[PDB]
């Protein structure tokens, strides 16, 4: 499960809402540890 | 991240060249199909 907002909400062009800024609770190289990761996805890569 | 400002990806086709290209395609379709009829080009019908 990924948590997201818009990358640049303050955009009035064709790209508004196209790039999303998402966060994860991601696996680290050690089995017992997690890391918080922020990354960008395109609208076409995700669904609600 | 984006080092600047967000823009949409796009492709540029010379308009006149494309029109000549279709004219050639239509002329050839007419050789076996529609010698005196109408050829209409349209956008794709749907799917992903």
């Amino acid at each position, epitope marked *: 499960t990924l948590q997201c907002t818009n990358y640049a*909400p*303050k955009l*009035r*062009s*064709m*790209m508004r809402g196209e790039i999303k800024n998402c966060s994860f609770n991601m696996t680290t190289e050690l089995r017992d540890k997690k890391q918080k990761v922020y990354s960008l996805f395109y609208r076409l890569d995700v669904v609600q | 991240d984006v080092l600047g*400002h967000v*823009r*949409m990806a*796009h492709c540029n086709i010379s308009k006149a060249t494309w029109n000549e290209t279709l004219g050639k395609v239509v002329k050839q379709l007419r050789k076996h199909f529609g010698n005196n009829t109408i050829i209409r080009f349209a956008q794709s019908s749907g799917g992903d």
Partner: antibody
Amino acid sequence: VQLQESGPGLVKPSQTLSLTCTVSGGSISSGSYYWSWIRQPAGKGLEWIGRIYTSGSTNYNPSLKSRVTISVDTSKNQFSLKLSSVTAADTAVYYCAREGFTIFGVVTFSEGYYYGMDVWGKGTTVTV
Amino acid sequence: ELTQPPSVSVSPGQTARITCSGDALPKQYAYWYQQKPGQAPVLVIYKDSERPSGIPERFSGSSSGTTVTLTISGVQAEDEADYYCQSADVFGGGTKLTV
């Protein structure tokens, strides 16, 4: 570019107004710019009236939408504002201004920020 | 859709903090103007804290969520003005700054 407003400095109550603005040293034709009017009652803050594109397309402040027509004379480089019947509540300064916009990308994709009014005139003061 | 304090006042040299808030702000850029009495408003800030060339370094600002702040560091007597902010639906309103 300088902006110079003109119009009646006095209108009767229940009487209409026609205001213009000359774009001096500039033109109304093309560019990323939009033309617009804003009202300022002498003791109040600003109220946007409306905007016009050089294409003729317009956007009016809902508060005055039924009362306002905006038009640009691109042969004269004069920006016009027409108001319906005017009352005491309209005893205000009417300003002419040019709103900006820029371009980063494709113009047809609207890739270009937005600016509010960058270039202002002096304002027509109208007694009602 | 925005609200503003009716006034702010500072001693010369202090930072003025003029704010605007409302529902459009998380999605739209704020723009700010400094209006001297008798003059058309001067744009000081655009696109959330960017300033036009010719505008003093005193003018800066920031935002979070629904609130935007226009900050003037080192406010001088020359800065007293009617300050306005806008976002759209297409305008806002303003605050009186005395020094």
